[PDB]
Design a protein around this ligand. Structure first.
Ligand SMILES: NC(=O)c1ccc[n+]([C@@H]2O[C@H](COP(=O)([O-])OP(=O)(O)OC[C@H]3O[C@@H](n4cnc5c(N)ncnc54)[C@H](OP(=O)(O)O)[C@@H]3O)[C@@H](O)[C@H]2O)c1
Ligand SMILES: NC(=O)c1ccc[n+]([C@@H]2O[C@H](COP(=O)([O-])OP(=O)(O)OC[C@H]3O[C@@H](n4cnc5c(N)ncnc54)[C@H](OP(=O)(O)O)[C@@H]3O)[C@@H](O)[C@H]2O)c1
Ligand SMILES: CCc1nc(N)nc(N)c1C#C[C@H](C)c1cc(-c2ccc(C(N)=O)cc2)ccc1Cl
Ligand SMILES: CCc1nc(N)nc(N)c1C#C[C@H](C)c1cc(-c2ccc(C(N)=O)cc2)ccc1Cl
Ligand SMILES: [Ca+2]
Lengths: 157, 156
């Protein structure tokens, strides 16, 4: 099973401010929608609650509490180990989709990074982890918008 | 200025049937929307007539005849003139079809965005051979009503 990771990181490293993404870069959300269409997303419970079960995605959510959801496209796991064990029986690809805790847990395990660098320095208290030295960018594209952003794909090895 | 190219190719090589793309692969259009957002698109006149001036894109349309009063659409008399003028205002253009424009520009583009669509349709518009100096650098498969696979190639 392949693990991808997709995130939008502002220029000071902030990805979140409490429950919010502290910016709106019009058009960048299209990248996220396109890459996650009909994919399995691995998300922390906090991010899952902020995003909801958007249509045409499948969600593996990790929680330490009794969190539940009766949506048939949502599977809830009590650990990341259990999530990954179960996911590899049912899919060949999972996209790690946040938030800070889940990114920090799994950054050393993922194969492909989708990073949109957002041209803003917002307030916030959630940051992206350091990127292991063995990742290299293989694709870059710049976008002008209300907040500019640059989309880069990194490959491991 | 860098040139990209974006296309969806069916399993038997068809990209069009007259003025239409002969499939509807739910989800694949999201890739096209995402990569072209606020970009300059170079398109042939026939493709521009089939797609129209969709919001949040800028169009360089080539014709030997045809006009548009849309402020986001530029009409050029040649691909050469389109490229000469685009380099004055942007560092990136996306070649977005159709068959004639792909054939004329494939040897000049730096990055390919190719979605392979799992259907074998009828049609009469095709895509050129990928030049041998291109290498795939990213691939992802999608299951949908018609499956599709997305691949980015870089010129080396
Ligand atoms: N691209 C972006 O910019 C982007 C992408 C995603 C989200 N975000 C932001 O990131 C923030 C949320 O990130 P976050 O770090 O605070 O929380 P998070 O990673 O989304 O979720 C944290 C929660 O997941 C559960 N969890 C974490 N590790 C676990 C483990 N090993 N086993 C079992 N459960 C585990 C716990 O849920 P329980 O509390 O239920 O036990 C934890 O409280 C938001 O601001 C959000 O907007 C930004
Ligand atoms: N991803 C996909 O599957 C995809 C993407 C886009 C398009 N398509 C398909 O491709 C088909 C259209 O392709 P096509 O080859 O027939 O037409 P096209 O490439 O879209 O346009 C051809 C016309 O562009 C003008 N032109 C071509 N070369 C020129 C040059 N060097 N200088 C000035 N003008 C030039 C001419 O316009 P005038 O006749 O006005 O002189 C020509 O008739 C449609 O089926 C469309 O659906 C498929
Ligand atoms: C577009 C932001 C982004 N960009 C990149 N590059 N990577 C990422 N991981 C994310 C993200 C995220 C979290 C998961 C999220 C997403 C959403 C959400 C809701 C609706 C839409 C839509 N199009 O309607 C889009 C996104 C809401 C809250 C959160 Cl917390
Ligand atoms: C999505 C298909 C695709 N995929 C990839 N990978 N590459 C490509 N170049 C294309 C294409 C195309 C031509 C240019 C086109 C596009 C459209 C059109 C109109 C509206 C929307 C929308 N807003 O949903 C989307 C597409 C209509 C006719 C044509 Cl002839
Ligand atoms: Ca020409």
């Amino acid at each position: 099973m392949k693990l991808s990771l997709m995130v939008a990181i502002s220029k000071n490293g902030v990805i979140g401010n409490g429950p919010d993404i502290p910016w709106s870069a019009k058009g960048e959300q299209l990248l996220f929608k396109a890459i996650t269409y009909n994919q399995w997303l691995l998300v922390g419970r906090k991010t899952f609650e902020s995003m909801g079960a958007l249509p045409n995605r499948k969600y593996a959510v990790v929680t330490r509490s009794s969190f539940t959801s009766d949506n048939e496209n949502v599977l809830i796991f009590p650990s990341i180990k259990d999530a990954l064990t179960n996911l590899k029986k049912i899919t060949d690809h999972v996209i790690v989709s946040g938030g800070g805790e889940i990114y920090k847990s799994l950054i050393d395990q993922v194969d492909t990074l989708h990073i949109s660098t957002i041209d803003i320095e917002p307030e916030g208290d959630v940051y992206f982890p350091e990127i292991p030295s063995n990742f290299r960018p293989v694709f870059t594209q710049d976008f002008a918008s209300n907040i500019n952003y640059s989309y880069q794909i990194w490959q491991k090895g």
